[PDB]
Design a protein around this nucleic acid. Sequence first.
DNA 1: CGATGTCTCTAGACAGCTGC
DNA 2: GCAGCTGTCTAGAGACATCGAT
Lengths: 168, 484
Amino acid sequence: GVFEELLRTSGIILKVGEGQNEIAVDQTAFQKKLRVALEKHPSYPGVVNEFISGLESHIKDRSQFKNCLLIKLLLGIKILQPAVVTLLLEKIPEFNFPRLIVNQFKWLDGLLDSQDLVKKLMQMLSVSPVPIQHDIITSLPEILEDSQQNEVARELSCLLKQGRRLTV
Amino acid sequence: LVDLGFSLMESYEMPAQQACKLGASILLETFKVHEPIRSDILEQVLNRVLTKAASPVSHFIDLLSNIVVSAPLVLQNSSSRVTETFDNLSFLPIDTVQGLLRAVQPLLKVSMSVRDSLILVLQKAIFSRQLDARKAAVAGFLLLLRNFKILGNEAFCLEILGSLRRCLSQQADVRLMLYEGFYDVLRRNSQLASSIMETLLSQIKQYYLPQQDLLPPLKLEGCIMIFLQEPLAHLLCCIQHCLAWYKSTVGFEQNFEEMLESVTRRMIKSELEDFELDKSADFSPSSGVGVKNNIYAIQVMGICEVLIEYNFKIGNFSKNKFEDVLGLFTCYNKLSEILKEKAGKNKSTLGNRIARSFLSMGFVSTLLTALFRDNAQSHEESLAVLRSSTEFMRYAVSVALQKVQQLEEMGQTDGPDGQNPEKMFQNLCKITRVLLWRYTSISISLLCLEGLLRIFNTMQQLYAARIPQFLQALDINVTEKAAF
DNA sequence: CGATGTCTCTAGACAGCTGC
DNA sequence: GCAGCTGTCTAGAGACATCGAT
């Protein structure tokens, strides 16, 4: 609930459901307010750890994920760099639902370590239905910004070799 | 008339160029004076530009610009049928997109719907991982920022800031043109300029290595993915030009100046002994490591050139900075005259000269005008020891030959004010005299004379309508001055 | 339909004709 | 005494005749 309190002082309201985002329409004051809140109360490993625990407890609800439909405010801090990744992992087995995060990650490249995250996304792709796998395969260029061309080309050629039915 | 013009552009593809001129003329006349058919003319020209890239098709964009600047309301009268044209990002968006946006600028500004369509099409285009698509996206970004003017709706200002910052993470090739185009939009903002400086400063901290005047700050290892990831020279050139603009306009700025000064003081103390490329033959074409040295070698040359502009501009007749310029070129020549063009690439005789320079046409004009045809008490005896560097003399003019050659082969150049034809016209009007004065002062003069041949060639071939002022600027009938 | 080979050449080099 | 200097040979690059069928 620490992240919930931090949202209460600077962020969204405590509303779990299917409503709209209770965030100010700006990124120079509300974002700065969230940054100063995250830089004033959390200043030690223990408090940031309990803040991470509160964030995991809060955002884990599917209602919050539907409310998300942004997340760039959370990614403004380095301490949530893998938190957004693991929340994406928690949101991915919801279908056809992951379309929201697929479109949300569009126009978003905040990441912890793309090289390992690529391996992890094909790892979850090994256990995905056909349609979601097709969308994710379309989304490999989305997660990159042309900085991992060689390995991604190698792996997509491997996918082409293994999968002929899903060549499109 | 309109059918004849349509088939005229069809039959074009010099008599063909004259046919293009005649067709553009007749289309413009029949559009200007005929009211109920101007929409038909707009539809015809919109349907004719598409699927036309093999032949030179600049005529379409230029006559479209002329007819919309004569009558901008036709597109709205045609219910803004330009939205479908946004798909042209895949055919040939090297220059057509830039000119098209230039033409449609006022109608994008007045009409909110077309602006929204443009922003959404470019937003979906930017994250397409195609080189061509990204080039089209960055080209459109170069224009959209200056499409909106507030320098003399604030959400519109602040929202566009992060797009290019995100795009900066992409390859070097798409990282290239943003460095050049940042100045054009920076001439059009006050606080957006501050944010752009902060973003560029954060970018340059990636390769700064803050160490206070020790082993050189070469983080070129990151620009290896045999390949290159970030053109440090272009980034440094943009940094210098934007810093000069900010200084002339009126926390980090003081830090910005000192770290730039620290780098200048570090290059003079970092010679080809602390450098990794101290070997005279480490370069090897068609090798995995030699080309890595080659890209490192070419990148540092641009690094030296940029700070030559900085020290000359930040210092004003101050002997301390002049010797810094000497040391910079000393590092430049010691590493450009030899190693490269000995083992890098000189097997074929070099038709051209000192490699592609990242200087300003304004700067080189100031340099030559201050160097030659300038002798005052403000001169601090620094040019006296600077004049001893005849190797610097040859480079000081060979860069100018490179710039006006860009104006010869192409219609533009590099550095600030590369697209404002009056601006270089004044620059060309100024540099020509000192170029002539250097020739008439008495190789070195061979360089300036070769330039004059290319000023006159460029003057007639490009600035044909602007000849009389240039002819009179050498101090109305052109012949009497020409005969002189 | 027009890619191609042939040819005036300008210079550079290291090597023969000056030298030594 | 083998140290000096003296020049056709070879590779650069650019314009033309036919190059060889579309």
